[PDB]
Amino acid sequence: SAFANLDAAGFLQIWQHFDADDNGYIEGKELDDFFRHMLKKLQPKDKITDERVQQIKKSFMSAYDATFDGRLQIEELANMILPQEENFLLIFRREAPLDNSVEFMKIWRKYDADSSGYISAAELKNFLKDLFLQHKKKIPPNKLDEYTDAMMKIFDKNKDGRLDLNDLARILALQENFLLQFKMDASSQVERKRDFEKIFAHYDVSRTGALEGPEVDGFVKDMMELVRPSISGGDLDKFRECLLTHCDMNKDGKIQKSELALCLGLKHKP
Complete domains list, the chain, with CATH: 1-81 (1.10.238.10), 82-182 (1.10.238.10), 183-270 (1.10.238.10)
Cα–Cα dist 202/145, whole Å:
46
Q: Quick one: CA torsion of 115, 253, 169, 196, rounded to 10 degrees?
A: -70
Cα–Cα dist 88/79, whole Å:
10
- Distance, C-alpha 245 to centroid of its chain: 17
Residue 190 burial (C-beta neighbours within 10 Å; 0-12, 13-18, 19+): exposed
Tell me if 204 is assigned to a ligand binding site. Answer: yes
Tell me if 21 is assigned to a ligand binding site. Answer: yes
Tell me if 245 is assigned to a ligand binding site. Answer: no
- Angle of CA points 211, 216, 222, to nearest 5°: 120
Cα–Cα dist 70/76, whole Å:
12
Tell me if 222 is assigned to a ligand binding site. Answer: no
Cα–Cα dist 117/96, whole Å:
24
Tell me if 254 is assigned to a ligand binding site. Answer: yes
Tell me if 59 is assigned to a ligand binding site. Answer: no
As beta bridge partners, residue 163 has 119
Tell me if 230 is assigned to a ligand binding site. Answer: no
Residue 219 · residue 203 · CB < 8 Å? yes
Cα–Cα dist 125/114, whole Å:
20
Tell me if 126 is assigned to a ligand binding site. Answer: no
Tell me if 46 is assigned to a ligand binding site. Answer: no
Residue 189 · residue 165 · CB < 8 Å? no
Cα–Cα dist 28/34, whole Å:
10
Nearest to 210 by CA among 165, 164, 265, 250: 250
Name residues whose C-beta falls within 8 Å of residue 196's C-beta, 6 or more positions apart in sequence: 223, 260, 261, 264, 266
Residue 228 burial (C-beta neighbours within 10 Å; 0-12, 13-18, 19+): middle
- Its sign, for the CA torsion 20, 21, 23, 29, is negative
Name residues whose C-beta falls within 8 Å of residue 174's C-beta, 6 or more positions apart in sequence: 9, 99, 101
Tell me if 208 is assigned to a ligand binding site. Answer: yes
Cα–Cα dist 130/150, whole Å:
18
Cα–Cα dist 59/44, whole Å:
19
DSSP the chain: ----PPPHHHHHHHHHHH-TT--SEEEGGGHHHHHHHHHHHHSTTS---HHHHHHHHHHTS-HHHHT--SEEEHHHHHHHHS-HHHHHHHHHHHHS----HHHHHHHHHHH-TT--SEEEGGGHHHHHHHHHHHTT----HHHHHHHHHHHHHHH-SS-SSEEEHHHHGGGS--SS-SSTTS---HHHHHHHHHHHHHHHHHH-TT--SEEETHHHHHHHHHHHHHHSSS--HHHHHHHHHHHHHHH--STT-EEEHHHHHHHTT-----
